[PDB]
């Protein structure tokens, strides 16, 4: 096995995001190795709550109201909508549709939004 330590693999767009959510204290630490990083993200972010904490750890006081326990469909969509609220208004970055995350349609857009959220906050120099 010829490991060439000059050219090593790099953590993918999803891997950095998972770790990013954990260090910000908005997502819990996994009990195992994450086989599906993007899938794990979608299932965890589906209810919006994690994204609400995410935005409140970067822009503290942007989420007007979050449902820590969303019973109704519109409640989950509202939590995601609050995330889109701040990221679309204050930051004005790559936004997506609540249906993409909640119904697991186009996660590629959701991940792009998360990565961009890291890009803009890095640009601030946090």
From Swiss-Prot:
Domain of life: Eukaryota
Residue stretches making up the Calponin-homology (CH) domain: 11-122
Post-translational modification: Phosphorylated by PTK2/FAK1; this promotes interaction with RAC1.
UniProt-annotated location(s): Cell junction, Focal adhesion; Cell projection, Ruffle; Cytoplasm, Cell cortex; Cell projection, Lamellipodium
Function per UniProt: Acts as a RAC1 guanine nucleotide exchange factor (GEF) and can induce membrane ruffling. Functions in cell migration, attachment and cell spreading. Promotes targeting of RAC1 to focal adhesions. May function as a positive regulator of apoptosis. Downstream of NMDA receptors and CaMKK-CaMK1 signaling cascade, promotes the formation of spines and synapses in hippocampal neurons.
Subunit structure: Interacts with PAK kinases through the SH3 domain. Interacts with GIT1 and TGFB1I1. Interacts with PTK2/FAK1 and RAC1. Interacts with ITCH and PARVB. Interacts with unphosphorylated PAK1. Interacts with SCRIB; interaction is direct and may play a role in regulation of apoptosis. Interacts with FRMPD4 (via N-terminus). Interacts with CaMK1. Interacts with BIN2. Interacts with YWHAZ. Interacts (via PH domain) with NOX1 (via FAD-binding FR-type domain).
Full protein name: Rho guanine nucleotide exchange factor 7
Organism: Homo sapiens (Human)
